[PDB]
Design a protein around this motif. Sequence first.
Motif, PDB file in Angstrom:
ATOM      1  N   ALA A  80      -8.408  25.473   2.369  1.00 19.98           N
ATOM      2  CA  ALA A  80      -9.077  25.880   3.584  1.00 19.98           C
ATOM      3  C   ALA A  80      -9.038  27.329   3.942  1.00 19.98           C
ATOM      4  CB  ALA A  80      -8.547  25.083   4.751  1.00 19.98           C
ATOM      5  N   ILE A  81      -7.944  28.005   3.629  1.00 20.27           N
ATOM      6  CA  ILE A  81      -7.807  29.400   4.024  1.00 20.27           C
ATOM      7  C   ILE A  81      -8.681  30.419   3.242  1.00 20.27           C
ATOM      8  CG2 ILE A  81      -5.804  30.132   2.669  1.00 20.27           C
ATOM      9  CD1 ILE A  81      -6.525  30.632   6.453  1.00 20.27           C
ATOM     10  N   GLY A  82      -9.315  29.958   2.159  1.00 23.35           N
ATOM     11  CA  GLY A  82     -10.210  30.818   1.386  1.00 23.35           C
ATOM     12  C   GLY A  82     -11.509  30.847   2.180  1.00 23.35           C
ATOM     13  N   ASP A 133      -3.318  39.239  10.801  1.00 22.06           N
ATOM     14  CA  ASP A 133      -4.684  39.756  10.579  1.00 22.06           C
ATOM     15  C   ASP A 133      -5.517  38.795   9.705  1.00 22.06           C
ATOM     16  OD1 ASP A 133      -4.236  42.094  12.095  1.00 22.06           O
ATOM     17  OD2 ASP A 133      -3.901  43.367  10.348  1.00 22.06           O
ATOM     18  N   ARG A 134      -4.915  38.333   8.619  1.00 15.27           N
ATOM     19  CA  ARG A 134      -5.578  37.407   7.705  1.00 15.27           C
ATOM     20  C   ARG A 134      -5.913  36.100   8.455  1.00 15.27           C
ATOM     21  NH1 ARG A 134      -7.941  34.239   4.777  1.00 15.27           N
ATOM     22  NH2 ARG A 134      -9.556  35.282   6.018  1.00 15.27           N
ATOM     23  N   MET A 135      -4.899  35.480   9.043  1.00 15.28           N
ATOM     24  CA  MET A 135      -5.110  34.236   9.776  1.00 15.28           C
ATOM     25  C   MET A 135      -6.075  34.440  10.939  1.00 15.28           C
ATOM     26  SD  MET A 135      -3.287  31.955   8.157  1.00 15.28           S
ATOM     27  CE  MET A 135      -2.827  30.596   9.217  1.00 15.28           C
ATOM     28  N   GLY A 136      -5.990  35.603  11.581  1.00 13.30           N
ATOM     29  CA  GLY A 136      -6.845  35.935  12.710  1.00 13.30           C
ATOM     30  C   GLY A 136      -8.298  36.000  12.265  1.00 13.30           C
ATOM     31  N   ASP A 137      -8.520  36.554  11.076  1.00 13.51           N
ATOM     32  CA  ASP A 137      -9.849  36.645  10.482  1.00 13.51           C
ATOM     33  C   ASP A 137     -10.427  35.239  10.252  1.00 13.51           C
ATOM     34  OD1 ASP A 137     -10.989  37.487   7.180  1.00 13.51           O
ATOM     35  OD2 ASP A 137     -12.101  37.570   9.061  1.00 13.51           O
ATOM     36  N   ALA A 138      -9.605  34.325   9.719  1.00 12.81           N
ATOM     37  CA  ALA A 138     -10.006  32.935   9.461  1.00 12.81           C
ATOM     38  C   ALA A 138     -10.358  32.219  10.758  1.00 12.81           C
ATOM     39  CB  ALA A 138      -8.917  32.204   8.782  1.00 12.81           C
ATOM     40  N   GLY A 139      -9.793  32.727  11.854  1.00 12.27           N
ATOM     41  CA  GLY A 139     -10.067  32.204  13.165  1.00 12.27           C
ATOM     42  C   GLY A 139      -8.886  31.668  13.926  1.00 12.27           C
ATOM     43  N   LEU A 147      -6.753  35.934  -0.300  1.00 10.66           N
ATOM     44  CA  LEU A 147      -7.035  35.400   1.031  1.00 10.66           C
ATOM     45  C   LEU A 147      -5.906  34.500   1.577  1.00 10.66           C
ATOM     46  CD1 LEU A 147     -10.846  34.618   0.863  1.00 10.66           C
ATOM     47  CD2 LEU A 147      -9.719  36.556   1.973  1.00 10.66           C
ATOM     48  N   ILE A 148      -4.921  34.202   0.737  1.00  7.76           N
ATOM     49  CA  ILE A 148      -3.800  33.346   1.106  1.00  7.76           C
ATOM     50  C   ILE A 148      -2.577  34.187   1.474  1.00  7.76           C
ATOM     51  CG2 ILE A 148      -2.230  31.537   0.288  1.00  7.76           C
ATOM     52  CD1 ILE A 148      -4.471  30.946  -1.937  1.00  7.76           C
ATOM     53  N   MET A 170      -8.489  23.682  11.215  1.00  9.46           N
ATOM     54  CA  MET A 170      -8.469  24.193   9.873  1.00  9.46           C
ATOM     55  C   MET A 170      -9.255  23.297   8.951  1.00  9.46           C
ATOM     56  SD  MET A 170      -5.278  25.240   7.439  1.00  9.46           S
ATOM     57  CE  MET A 170      -4.884  23.734   6.709  1.00  9.46           C
ATOM     58  N   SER A 171      -9.382  22.023   9.310  1.00 10.80           N
ATOM     59  CA  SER A 171     -10.064  21.044   8.449  1.00 10.80           C
ATOM     60  C   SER A 171     -11.565  21.261   8.336  1.00 10.80           C
ATOM     61  CB  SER A 171      -9.793  19.607   8.925  1.00 10.80           C
ATOM     62  OG  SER A 171     -10.409  19.365  10.183  1.00 10.80           O
ATOM     63  N   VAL A 172     -12.124  22.025   9.252  1.00  3.55           N
ATOM     64  CA  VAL A 172     -13.546  22.260   9.243  1.00  3.55           C
ATOM     65  C   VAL A 172     -13.943  23.726   9.071  1.00  3.55           C
ATOM     66  CG1 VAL A 172     -14.095  20.125  10.528  1.00  3.55           C
ATOM     67  CG2 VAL A 172     -13.629  22.224  11.759  1.00  3.55           C
ATOM     68  N   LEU A 173     -13.034  24.561   8.577  1.00  5.04           N
ATOM     69  CA  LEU A 173     -13.399  25.965   8.324  1.00  5.04           C
ATOM     70  C   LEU A 173     -14.476  25.900   7.234  1.00  5.04           C
ATOM     71  CD1 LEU A 173     -10.025  27.923   7.992  1.00  5.04           C
ATOM     72  CD2 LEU A 173     -11.597  27.951   9.913  1.00  5.04           C
ATOM     73  N   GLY A 174     -15.626  26.511   7.490  1.00  5.28           N
ATOM     74  CA  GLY A 174     -16.711  26.477   6.528  1.00  5.28           C
ATOM     75  C   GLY A 174     -17.759  25.397   6.820  1.00  5.28           C
ATOM     76  N   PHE A 175     -17.491  24.527   7.801  1.00  9.36           N
ATOM     77  CA  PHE A 175     -18.416  23.449   8.163  1.00  9.36           C
ATOM     78  C   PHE A 175     -18.631  23.349   9.669  1.00  9.36           C
ATOM     79  CE2 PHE A 175     -16.127  22.657   4.339  1.00  9.36           C
ATOM     80  CZ  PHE A 175     -17.069  22.196   3.427  1.00  9.36           C
ATOM     81  N   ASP A 176     -19.644  22.579  10.065  1.00 15.60           N
ATOM     82  CA  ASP A 176     -19.957  22.340  11.477  1.00 15.60           C
ATOM     83  C   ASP A 176     -19.427  20.945  11.715  1.00 15.60           C
ATOM     84  OD1 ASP A 176     -20.979  21.738  13.979  1.00 15.60           O
ATOM     85  OD2 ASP A 176     -23.046  22.346  13.501  1.00 15.60           O
ATOM     86  N   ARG A 177     -18.472  20.804  12.628  1.00 13.90           N
ATOM     87  CA  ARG A 177     -17.892  19.490  12.858  1.00 13.90           C
ATOM     88  C   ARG A 177     -18.864  18.446  13.383  1.00 13.90           C
ATOM     89  NH1 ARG A 177     -13.114  18.761  14.902  1.00 13.90           N
ATOM     90  NH2 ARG A 177     -13.857  16.729  15.687  1.00 13.90           N
TER      91      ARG A 177
END
Length: 336
Positions: free
Chosen positions: A50-52, A157-163, A144-145, A272-279
């Motif tokens: 998920a974090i990628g 910063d990294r985690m903040g970027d992911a949201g 990215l990890i 985190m389960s929906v990073l990259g998708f629309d729930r």
Amino acid sequence: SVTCPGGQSTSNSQCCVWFDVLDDLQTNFYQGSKCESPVRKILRIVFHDAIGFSPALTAAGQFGGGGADGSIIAHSNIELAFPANGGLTDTVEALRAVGINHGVSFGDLIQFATAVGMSNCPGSPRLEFLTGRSNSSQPSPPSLIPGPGNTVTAILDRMGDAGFSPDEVVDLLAAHSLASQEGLNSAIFRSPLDSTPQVFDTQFYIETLLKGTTQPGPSLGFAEELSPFPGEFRMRSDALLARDSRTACRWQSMTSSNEVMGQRYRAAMAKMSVLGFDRNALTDCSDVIPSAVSNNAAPVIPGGLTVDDIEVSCPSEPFPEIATASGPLPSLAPAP
Ligand code: HEM
Ligand SMILES: *[C@@H]1O[C@H](CO)[C@@H](O[C@@H]2O[C@H](CO)[C@@H](O)[C@H](O)[C@H]2NC(C)=O)[C@H](O)[C@H]1NC(C)=O
Ligand SMILES: [Ca+2]
Ligand SMILES: [Ca+2]
Ligand SMILES: [Mg+2]
């Protein structure tokens, strides 16, 4: 509603395949619904898959990664060579086979295996489960990890970027309450991160805040700090996040109530389960997820240590009243 081919009642016919996946996972991958290494490996996998995801790379015109897309399995040839992805091959191949056999996307499978695996560990909340993520994905960009040698600024910063906010970063780390390390110091293979690697409890938050006094292994491994007792490994990033002024107060608030810890963790995981998708594009099959047995033990400062041995790092808030156990100092056995 719908009644699946095996009698199981559920809210959408899309959830039916998941009852077979559950039976397969519990029987084979989890060797009989156990809370051992496979669950721990799978938890590493869900976070690393998920974090990628990086809105910053995307805004700049580059590919930022597809998030929780199962890329770690579909493109393991690339991703498993990333420094942070060691000791995952066997788990990834095990998961590759179940998804292929049941015809479920690698992305949904990772989220499902996470929710199921956690149900096998006493104390765990019941994770939400959505299905429908496309099976197609591109390899995640490298770097990215977050790593255990990173600064708090770098991790945030990294985690903040992911949201994720600093609070959510601390909440997501509750997963280390069911953790060990196999690659940071192979001499103490599977040394746990807390005294209860098979119980999803606040021990991790409490124990990482104690004064480091012990070197559990023959030597100090990569990103290893002194821990509070024999057998316990303490990683640098965790020791730093516990004490940093941006995250210390949230970490401190996680020490006293298993209930509150679980609520926050479930919420951050759903996100985190929906990073990259629309729930609202996915289907909710949370009803398939089993419940974990309850943990009745109270959060405790173990083996004779007291609040005096806690490096209180939140000024604005006093350290909560926790139960104190009697000595001597415990000596942890390797996680199963
Ligand atoms: C701030 C970021 C984090 C860092 C830098 C970090 C780092 C690590 C490292 C280096 C290990 C040791 C792995 C080994 O050597 O075998 C590990 C173990 C683990 N991590 Fe993290 N982690 C972080 C966040 C998370 C998150 C958010 C999750 C999942 C929700 C997670 C779940 C786990 C689990 C369960 C293990 C135990 C693996 C095992 O016992 O085999 N971590 N983590
Ligand atoms: C999801 O995508 C993967 C590949 O990204 C598919 O995997 C291949 O599946 C075939 C059989 O269908 C195997 O012989 C290959 O070894 C698999 N490749 C990899 C990299 O694993 C998978 O079948 C897809 N699943 C669905 C349900 O569409
Ligand atoms: Ca991914
Ligand atoms: Ca624990
Ligand atoms: Mg003393």
